[PDB]
Amino acid sequence: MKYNTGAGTVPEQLNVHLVPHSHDDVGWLKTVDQYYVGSENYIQEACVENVLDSVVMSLQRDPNRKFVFGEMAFFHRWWLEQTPETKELVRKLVKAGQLEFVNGGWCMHDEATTHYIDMIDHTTLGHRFIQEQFNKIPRAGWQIDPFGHSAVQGYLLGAELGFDSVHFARIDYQDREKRKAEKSLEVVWRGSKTFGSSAQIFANAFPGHYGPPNGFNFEVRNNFVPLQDDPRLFDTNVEERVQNFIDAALTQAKITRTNHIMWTMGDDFQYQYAESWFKQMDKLIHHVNKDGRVNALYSTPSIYTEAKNAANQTWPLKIDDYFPYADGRNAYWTGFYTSRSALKDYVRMLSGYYLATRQLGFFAGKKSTKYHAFDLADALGIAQHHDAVSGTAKQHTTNDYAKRLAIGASKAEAVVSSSLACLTSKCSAPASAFSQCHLFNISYCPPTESSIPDDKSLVVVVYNPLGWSRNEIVRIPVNDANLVVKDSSGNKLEVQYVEMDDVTANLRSFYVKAYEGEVPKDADVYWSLFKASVPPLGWSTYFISELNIGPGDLKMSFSSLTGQLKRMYNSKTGVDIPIQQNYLWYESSEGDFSDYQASGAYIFRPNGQPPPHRSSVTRVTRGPLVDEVHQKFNSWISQVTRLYKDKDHAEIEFTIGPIPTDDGVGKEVITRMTSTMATNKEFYTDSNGRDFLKRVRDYREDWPLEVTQPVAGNYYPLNLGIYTKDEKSEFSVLVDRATGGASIKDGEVELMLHRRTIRDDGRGVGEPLDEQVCMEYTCEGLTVRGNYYLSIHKPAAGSRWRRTTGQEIYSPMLLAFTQENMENWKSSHSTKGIYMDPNYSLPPSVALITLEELDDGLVLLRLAHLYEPSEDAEYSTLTKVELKKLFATQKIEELREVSLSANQEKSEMKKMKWSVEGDDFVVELGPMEIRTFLLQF
Amino acid sequence: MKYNTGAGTVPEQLNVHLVPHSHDDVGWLKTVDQYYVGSENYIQEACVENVLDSVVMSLQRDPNRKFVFGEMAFFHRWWLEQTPETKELVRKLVKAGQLEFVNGGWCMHDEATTHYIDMIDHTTLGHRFIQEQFNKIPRAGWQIDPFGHSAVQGYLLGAELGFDSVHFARIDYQDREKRKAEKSLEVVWRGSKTFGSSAQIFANAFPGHYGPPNGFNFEVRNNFVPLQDDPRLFDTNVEERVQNFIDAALTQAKITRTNHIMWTMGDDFQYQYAESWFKQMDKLIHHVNKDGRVNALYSTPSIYTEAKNAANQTWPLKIDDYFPYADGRNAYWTGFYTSRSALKDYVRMLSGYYLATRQLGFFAGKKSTKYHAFDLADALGIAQHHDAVSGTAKQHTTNDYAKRLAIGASKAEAVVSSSLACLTSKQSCSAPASAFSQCHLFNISYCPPTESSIPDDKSLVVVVYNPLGWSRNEIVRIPVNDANLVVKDSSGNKLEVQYVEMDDVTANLRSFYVKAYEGEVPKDADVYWSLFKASVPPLGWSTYFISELNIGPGDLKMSFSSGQLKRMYNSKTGVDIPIQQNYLWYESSEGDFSDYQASGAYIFRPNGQPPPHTSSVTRVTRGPLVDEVHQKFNSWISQVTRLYKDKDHAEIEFTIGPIPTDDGVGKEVITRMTSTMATNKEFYTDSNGRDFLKRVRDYREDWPLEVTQPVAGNYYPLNLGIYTKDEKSEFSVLVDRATGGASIKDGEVELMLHRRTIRDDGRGVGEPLDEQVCMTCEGLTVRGNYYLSIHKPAAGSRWRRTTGQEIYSPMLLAFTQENMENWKSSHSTKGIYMDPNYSLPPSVALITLEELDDGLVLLRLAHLYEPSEDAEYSTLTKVELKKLFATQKIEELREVSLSANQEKSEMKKMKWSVEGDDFVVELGPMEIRTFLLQF
Ligand SMILES: *[C@@H]1O[C@H](CO)[C@@H](O[C@@H]2O[C@H](CO)[C@@H](O[C@@H]3O[C@H](CO[C@H]4O[C@H](CO[C@H]5O[C@H](CO)[C@@H](O)[C@H](O)[C@@H]5O[C@H]5O[C@H](CO)[C@@H](O)[C@H](O)[C@@H]5O)[C@@H](O)[C@H](O[C@H]5O[C@H](CO)[C@@H](O)[C@H](O)[C@@H]5O[C@H]5O[C@H](CO)[C@@H](O)[C@H](O)[C@@H]5O)[C@@H]4O)[C@@H](O)[C@H](O[C@H]4O[C@H](CO)[C@@H](O)[C@H](O)[C@@H]4O[C@H]4O[C@H](CO)[C@@H](O)[C@H](O)[C@@H]4O[C@H]4O[C@H](CO)[C@@H](O)[C@H](O)[C@@H]4O)[C@@H]3O)[C@H](O)[C@H]2NC(C)=O)[C@H](O)[C@H]1NC(C)=O
Ligand SMILES: *[C@@H]1O[C@H](CO)[C@@H](O[C@@H]2O[C@H](CO)[C@@H](O)[C@H](O)[C@H]2NC(C)=O)[C@H](O)[C@H]1NC(C)=O
Ligand SMILES: [Zn+2]
Ligand SMILES: [Zn+2]
């Protein structure tokens, strides 16, 4: 028989847009490559190679069929294995619109724990491949699975990508009930207070899930009811299946606006045998349309969106974001804002390093390796997946993520070392030219711990990947107490020696072996500190050879008894608050009689009894470069509070772990900073590191909140920081990794820093969050170390500290080490230098977030304005960058402004119109703008 | 990557022949149509449409890939749904050898409980379709799942089909161990004592199962190890999988002759997503061959056999058959020789009816409907499947089989009625199906056309059609309510009649079963049976008009006590044996301390207790047409022993059921005939109704039997009968349906007639054999006949063959009520389609006569006798086709292969080295000859 599969939409009927899809997690229960090749099916039945193999075969059979695919990490692995004939067929299918890419990033990223730079990076990696191979520009965002949604997702990784729509299944369960009653599941979303309706997007929250209606999952070997329409066979059932379809459509139509609804015909790793789905949908389209009561068609989320836009219809407005997400009264998905803190820091650390690596590679003329096997672009792109950096994957998968990142990091280190060798010489240089250290956090740096030969110095090359001037304390572990530090002009520098401590020494013994395989040499005896001063986008070289604290304007007071913070004050600016800082933990709920929901990798459900709260100072240190207060809170919680020279903030280094759980009680550890500030239930948290959103305790803008979790319901994901304010003071906290934050009482701010549960939370990963480090065999709970940064300012002056320090935290100095005689080094190498015009800086409002060599001589460049319109009187203004002065040693031959993911000419982007309820080479940038360019030299 | 998938065989290496396949049962746990469309997957995950869909897609991708498909019932359903473009692609794939048909019958038939006529019929149905669509002749037989194997399967449904080989997984578990040790899994099999090496076949018993080696099942969503050969991905494992492959190959090579082994790369309903399998096989062929230690290739069973034949090798000989089959110590698969007796009888009845239907349709010029939806050809072909007539399907599937047969039977009944109305009319086709009425529930006394009153001036007209090519006299026995009826022949003479009174057992059956079968309660049980002797020419009709203690009317006499049988003797021939007949039942094992195995639909495992025992005469009847003894053995077992006029045998009618199981004891019911004949552990049973094979109690020719089941291991499948003999007597028993039979003690013969168990036997059907009828449910009751006689040595074979054919092909009765003189005025009361006075020789049966498409007529003649059997009839003979078709003129005649897909003269045979080595149709013993005719 011939089936009428070419149906389109019809004006006077309900139209059911059938959208075939396969939700393909880039790692979760299995690793990425296991998901691809289909191995380890006893863990989960899933093979992406089958999905792409069989979808292509099924699309070829009938030109009216469609399918949407998203995750280029999988698509690219598949593409490279395909014959020239299959590639030709795919080009034909894509050109005809049978295979449409939605999202099109390397992965479907989490929106809570990801930084906007990494979001842009992997989205560009996928989009460039799609543009190059198929001359296609994705128009529909696909966020069907991520656990809540960010403002930046709507306007920046939505509107500004050129997407007309974004689609997602998960919103708060109370919000969903209201949105069904209001028919407000579909909205026009304006995620930027700054850009408003100029960066808006059609946002489609599905009624329930991203699967088909009940009885319309057609995966091979499932117990579905086939449509039997052959009269030569027993038990035809055409009428029954058509009525099944109509019934489900009419139910959806009652909670949806216009005469178009969308069915997401697919689920996790479905379409292993695509024809099993396409057979039934062929028959349903045919027989439903013969019946004619409703209308069915093969469709895509962009065809659906075009239909919704063409309807004469006015749409509800959405502002701000969809955080936090809860799918039940005791199930707030705010635990994963912190889950796997060590992986989250690893991602953030490598993201900064990768930004500097790409700068240096460009300046040194190194060629792109973005699509080579195991490149850092692949590993960091994968790491953005909504089970990866979010921390909601199985342990073995998580280990695989870190293995991939380590491989990419090792390749980046060689690029950085070889580029610095060419660039400082007065590119072919071997990676052996410089050594580098990434284990300063546990005091492990062989290049600086090693004895310096006679008539030689330790050469320290310091590279600054910011477009700003920067001074900064260099802090290296050494074994000689009588070292002299000279700058490049021969001046001896003021140094400070800091003694090794026992907490770090025990970390060093355990973790160096865990990471490298064997025990290191003795815990070095000192840290040597000195202040480096480095040009923007450039380097300097240094030669090394044989109760109250605060060396600058900011001061802290501590109890001499329970050595806890009591006060912060700035002498020069005259801000002064009594403030206490302590460590607590919530006990993880394991459920009860009325609700068995446990706390786990996704969900934070505390017991509801007050968080368990004998600290002592074990050291006070004073010196010209740092004042430090070592605090011991218990045997597994220790902290060093550091006030460094010329730093307008305190650096609070935490060390948490092993979290003891032999007592059978999960523990989720917070730092809490308590003041008497009249914060009036308000607190501010960032969106993917950009806009700050005003959060209000126990309040929701879009629905009348029923309070069920007075703590977990007030946690928000941080990637830059959290701040509060009253009439007199602004209290700001910046993080060094994705972190959950909240204000549970007025004047009080807390960060959740580490979590270990005994139970799984029943959302599919099947594992308690029980991170352990092992060795014969000596296993213990994981220990995390990091910094948070706190400061005080007068109203309207904290903004510039948050933006400036946030960028310095993101992009620290890079240190490169070698041992050579100073005289001979100076005679063969430039010791100070700049790739920009000498004496040029980017404006303090701007950051160079992308500088990267692509194929040919194409260079990708992105500049971001860091401030929102009312943040800083001086910096929240129009500014300019002189690209000629950015690129002093070269001459720009062509400049082309492009879309954020660089797959469109900027001037050719067009926007849909919506009716919404309630309605020289100098680059200018206004607040929050990001501009993207392709250059030729 | 490009994979090197085009490998052939290489001479100096072990060759692994990868044969992709999907074992698709034509009904079993789901119905045929559920298996096809993929519904009810909660019962079993299985969709044949996906198999053919995805296999065609995978073969199209790479011309070196191959796949073999068997069951045309499924292929034909799929074919009718395909587009022109898909049909052309299949034609290309078949023409290229990528898709090869193995077996090619409508199904893969059971070999135990099937009749050779039905095996030929469904096989011709599939082979004609394959030949017509693709111009292909299958060369490899495919019996991978049937539960043991028959002699007729080897020589007739193998060699005589033109197959060079036949392949199967199941043989006896003791026999398999010896064959592994002797490397005699593969043999040259000569299943015919008569034809020997002239009808031989290469028989390949697989090492264990028809699946892949462990770790080489690649079905979508299974937990196999994919071969990961991309170095851009983690965890490449090429070397490991190549070694996995080599290891499995070496193990099989240790028990196989030559440098060629075969992997059956598939299983039940596999290849739902074919590419999952072909991806792995592509990679294995490529990397195994790059490795070079062994050689792998896409192959088929016929390519494999060709390599076995080209090898320098002598092969062990196989004679006779592979029955019975056991897969373990207490697991003889001999229960299904009886299981579902009522379905087995239904199949056998409809087979004989369908033979007569095709005769009459040809004579009346009716058009062929063989490939029409729900035709009897489809229903009877499906019924031969190795879970269908064998009785080993689920109950719901079993009901579906019977539903389909009933649809086909209704269609054939209309063909028979319309055809007879045209053919008996004086001016001879337009006649309506309403012209005649017909009755198929005589067994429960239900025949409205004869029970109803006859109007005045009218007679009950009885047309009697005889589908045998022999003259036949037989007793017509119809249920009537009038005691003063007269029966006149066509000349007007009154015939001798005998009235038999209704009995309570049959009346109790009638009320229940008519309502069950027809949906409505019938009128009062009829008061009498009217009996008269009819005499009909061969392939012709006669017309009759109806209006207003020692027994035996003939030579054969039987003695009973005043109620058990005690003696049979024939005064005229001089045979005389004391013989007792009784009913017993084995108690079904439910497992014991040594072995959990239970008796079930497949496996007969009796309890180890001796069979419990049952008795009184309820009626003795004497008359000129029949003497009868009615016997009640218990409340659920009764019998009528009947000695009819001019019948050289007694006809024993059994009625068994409901078998009571509320006591928790399953029961397997036998009739046992006990004599003092010195049978010396020997007894003879037929092969699919044809050759008789000599069975020896507790003895196996091919291996030294370790006796573990002294009863179940001696059961054999019957489709014609069982007999014994000594120096003085020959004792013969003929069945009316597939039945299990045995001789457990010398001079003793038993039939298993009905079985009801409380447990399943753990071979996959998941159901106790617990048949019930409902409206109110009770265990199923079966009624039927077995036939016994006694003869001098060397003259019982004549009775076996003659009576066997008469049982298979009884008269057809057609009724109408009209005035006798009026009927004779517009109808011929006598007729014959052959020449007047022409008869087929007594040794020959017309087993096929049917109109095909266009003017094409298919004819088959069988010589019924083996060389040893009858001095007069085991001889060369001839049929004159000009006299066979008196009414017509032969324009064209071609002799063809048995399944009519090859010209006979063009068939070629492989040569093997075997250890130990006018239109007149002549027929030698056991020959079957097949012709295509045009008129
Ligand atoms: C003696 O001899 C004989 C010979 O002759 C033998 O044998 C027998 O025979 C007979 C005849 O004669 C037969 O009968 C037949 O049968 C068939 C079959 O049956 C079976 O099956 C069925 C079906 O089944 C199915 O279905 C159901 C429902 O659903 C179920 O249940 C089952 O299970 C199955 O299922 C499956 O399949 C399906 C598909 O197919 C699917 O769907 C599903 O899912 C699954 O899978 C059934 O039903 C039945 O049952 C019944 O019966 C029984 C007994 O047998 C009982 O037990 C039961 O209970 C029942 O009964 C009840 O019910 C009913 C009904 O309601 C009532 O009536 C009663 O009363 C009671 O209550 C069985 O099981 C059949 O088919 C047939 O039938 C037919 O025919 C009649 C007359 O003849 C009538 O009545 C009916 O109705 C029918 O009709 C139809 O068809 C025809 C043709 O055939 C035509 O013509 C007509 O027209 C009609 O049609 C049309 O219409 C319809 C209506 O509806 C429709 O359907 C359509 O569409 C068309 O259009 C008959 O019955 C028998 O079988 C035999 N047997 C054996 C065992 O085989 C004997 O045996 C002897 N006896 C001594 C020896 O004793
Ligand atoms: C099969 O193999 C046998 C074993 O070698 C071959 O027989 C040998 O071949 C020649 C005779 O043709 C002589 O050199 C040997 O005396 C033979 N030996 C035996 C034991 O026969 C045989 O030629 C091969 N081919 C065939 C068709 O038999
Ligand atoms: Zn997901
Ligand atoms: Zn089978």
Side-chain angles (χ1 to χ4, degrees), chain A residues 33 41-42 45 49 53 80-81 220-223 230 232-234 272-273 279 371 373-374 400, chain B residues 33 41-42 45 49 53 80-81 220-223 230 232-234 272-273 279 371 373-374 400:
Chain A
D33 282 351
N41 271 345
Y42 78 96
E45 292 161 13
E49 183 175 12
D53 287 350
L80 300 176
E81 300 182 347
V220 66
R221 302 175 67 173
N222 278 357
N223 179 49
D230 186 336
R232 306 187 37 110
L233 308 179
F234 287 176
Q272 285 215 58
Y273 176 42
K279 187 185 297 298
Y371 298 102
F374 317 122
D400 182 79
Chain B
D33 282 352
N41 269 345
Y42 79 93
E45 299 159 15
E49 185 175 8
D53 286 350
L80 300 193
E81 297 178 357
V220 68
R221 295 174 72 174
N222 273 8
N223 183 46
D230 186 348
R232 303 191 37 118
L233 309 183
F234 289 168
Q272 284 209 61
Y273 178 38
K279 180 186 299 300
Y371 299 100
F374 320 120
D400 180 79

Side-chain angles (χ1 to χ4, degrees), chain A residues 23-26 28 108 144-147 210 268 385-387:
Chain A
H23 182 56
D24 303 329
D25 290 312
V26 184
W28 180 39
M108 179 184 303
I144 64 181
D145 203 18
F147 329 132
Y210 52 76
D268 286 19
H385 163 61
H386 52 275
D387 299 301

